Amino acid sequence: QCQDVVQDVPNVDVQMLELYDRMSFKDIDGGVWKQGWNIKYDPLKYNAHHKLKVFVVPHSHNDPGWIQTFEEYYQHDTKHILSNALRHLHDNPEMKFIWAEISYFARFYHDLGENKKLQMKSIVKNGQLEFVTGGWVMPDEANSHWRNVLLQLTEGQTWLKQFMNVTPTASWAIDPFGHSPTMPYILQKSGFKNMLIQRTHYSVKKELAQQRQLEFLWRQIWDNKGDTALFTHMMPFYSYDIPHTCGPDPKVCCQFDFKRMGSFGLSCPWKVPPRTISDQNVAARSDLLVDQWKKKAELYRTNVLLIPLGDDFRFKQNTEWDVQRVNYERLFEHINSQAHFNVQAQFGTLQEYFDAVHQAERAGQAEFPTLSGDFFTYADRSDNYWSGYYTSRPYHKRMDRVLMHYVRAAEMLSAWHSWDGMARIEERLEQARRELSLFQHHDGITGTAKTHVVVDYEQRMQEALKACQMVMQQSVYRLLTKPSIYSPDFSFSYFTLDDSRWPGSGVEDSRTTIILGEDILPSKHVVMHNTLPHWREQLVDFYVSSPFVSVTDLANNPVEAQVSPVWSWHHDTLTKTIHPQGSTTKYRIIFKARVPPMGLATYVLTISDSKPEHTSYASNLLLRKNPTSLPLGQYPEDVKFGDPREISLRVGNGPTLAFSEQGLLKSIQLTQDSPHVPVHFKFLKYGVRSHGDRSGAYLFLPNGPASPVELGQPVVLVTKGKLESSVSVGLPSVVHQTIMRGGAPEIRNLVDIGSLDNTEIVMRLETHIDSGDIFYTDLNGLQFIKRRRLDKLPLQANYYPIPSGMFIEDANTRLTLLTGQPLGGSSLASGELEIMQDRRLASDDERGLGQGVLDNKPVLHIYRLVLEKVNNCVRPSKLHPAGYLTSAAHKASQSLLDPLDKFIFAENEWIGAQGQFGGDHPSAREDLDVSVMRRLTKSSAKTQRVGYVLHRTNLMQCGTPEEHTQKLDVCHLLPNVARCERTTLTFLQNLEHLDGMVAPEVCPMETAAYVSSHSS
């Protein structure tokens, strides 16, 4: 029943990796269409029986923060554009306008009196104002996780369904810096029929236009059948502004932007201004414009022509509405009434355009090509590739992934019950979803906003994190307290969250210490949550006030623990070294938590006065010349010292890792008998060009290949434990840590680029894997796409988004690097992988930001590194454009994105405490996830509804029998189910009423949504 996503190479007309291999990329002057050619048309193509139908579609691009904050733009610009849109559309019935950004529309609509709300609904209802896409924002497509692209789409479309009674089926994405097939994937599963994109490489626009392949059915790279396909229109020219939307010649098009005559402080840089259309000039002006239109129409297959009309924060002034509308109405009246043009032009919406295109298709007038692949990495001109923003402001890129998971955890934990309105659960969840959704903006997560705007986004996300913690800790307290004893105050903190990796050590001493003592408090309850739908074990750590601490579960079974020191690293401006200080007042306890599917498990930490039986202590070795002592308060094991030397480590049965005398990995040995496979970590730096174009927040323009960071004689700390060992090294700008818990290691980098202007720090892996020019990166955490390094393209063009992982392989061996944050990366030579850590840029890169990137702050980046043998795996064939993770690599990714959550009970005694929740939840097959669980009704609703999004990835078969699991039916997760429906992914439309109230699982690479209904 399921399509095979590995063994059948789809046959498509345009496959982007194939196309890239053949294309030339030469940047030649095409004349007035600088990046194309002089377009020619046959004037007899259009006649009385076959007219060119032109839809002029007014629009206004509103960034939800960029050079101003969201609120500053809203106050200064967007409230005026929307207010005047309402008035001018109401007063002028044939005028049309499209609107994309629902965050702004919702901000506006709730400031409206009821009379204006009714006026607004009627212009939507009558088709004059039409929403396109309807997401909270127009998201970035490179760095964004698919889960947050769906979150934001849902947030906007749920608002529109509720308040406007509409759900867009056409998408408008004119500004993200390059485009991802994740978008048609999600849109086609959310009821969409059409989408439009703009920022694609100038060479690709040229290549597709030549073949009239700018409109295509965009299917996923593994889709043999074509059921994922979504009709897509790619705009043909450099910009979405009016000079680049009427036709190939911007000197002519600029004359039809009526806001550029002088009083608005805008002009035409091609030096010919617009002129008011009058009876005396209309024929001449019409001739000029129709000629542009007929040239643009040559690039497409039907007799229906899309002409966007708009630019940033347009349609603001009343006078601007008038100047655009009246001039265009004069042009339309003359053109439509002059038979010799054979054109019928009118204002239109995006849906009107698509509807007319498909009527032409149905009339047998055109057939469209099929296409798969992506549109990274974008260049708007010459060698200006937009790979910088895959890394810019990496602190916030990491914060995105943290908040992603905390939103999922808060919605899932609180979904199990209906809550009294006084608990304010819905209020806090809506704020969290909205601040996370806002940051998906293509100047948010991208790190392309001004410094004060980045501060706005961070403050909003911090409040979101606080709202998630409040919901989660209230939910835990209810789920784990005997019901007849449960006594909530909805404002109280029952638990606080403890997060080891955010903001992370060296970024903030945020972590509370559990304070225990014979004379104060003997013990403390802790609870772990597991948001994944399978049983999971994972080591968890806490800070405690004594090393003599032991762990039990709630059946009072001893649990094996390990105590280590708390080490922090310091730039000692006295000795000019970066070296570790051990706490004398705090220690770390580590143990394996075991947690049910989508469930909770409670443990207890108890103090004693001597070494507890089931707690071990790590040994610590500080490698450096000229050591000084390192006292550890009560820690029972003295630190040892040595000169720098190679070391090797092995935890459990896991691999054995060897390290250079500078504390960097050199090799991995998978098994006792197996070879020591060379795997070398190295840190290098890129600079900036001294003449020609400068790197900035968007552009990566290196002055040549990277050069090695000079390491000097760094201090190396080795901690060796039965449960966890690690090697940490203080390098310039980076504290680099390799952590071993018995499987693939975890890597943590505390990245502080300091005042190193015009530097980009890269972390590279050097191996002997014979990968050649092939490597794999992911798109939005959803799929892995095959990349080919091309020497015909400059270094920065071979950079791709690494939203969650990358790998290289040959016939026998693969190395996969999974990330806890989106960064930019590449494989610049056979056997290499590399990924940028941070970048500090003193110059602006001429894209409107008006600043470089000089606001860096310490960030803790996290990874997993998985070396595997793959000669037994069933892989796609050489011509297949996709790759797939193994089970180990997928679980390693899950450990970074969705770790166990840790809660510490906040008061002395928790009466009515329970050991576990969710013990009877089905433990689903490892490739299946419950991506979203969200209660969709408030408590007063008679019929409760709960939405689930189910996603199944596809894992390589490498011969692990690995079987027996339980079927997961989400519809029977809550009791008293009365109906089960399959829905669109936004939950807004029912697609199937399901027999037996049973939600079937989905196929590999498919994502489904279900809603269960419950009598209450």
Ligand SMILES: CCCCCCCCN[C@@H]1C=C(CO)[C@@H](O)[C@H](O)[C@H]1O
């Ligand atoms: C290259 C021309 C400078 C831009 C003039 C006005 C802003 C155009 N539009 C803006 C531009 C950029 C980057 O170029 C994006 O970051 C914004 O999100 C976009 O709205």
Ligand SMILES: *[C@@H]1O[C@H](CO)[C@@H](O)[C@H](O)[C@H]1NC(C)=O
């Ligand atoms: C919502 O739109 C539908 C179209 O499905 C229409 O029939 C209905 O009247 C609308 N509801 C309201 C409140 O107008």
Ligand SMILES: [Zn+2]
């Ligand atoms: Zn924009």
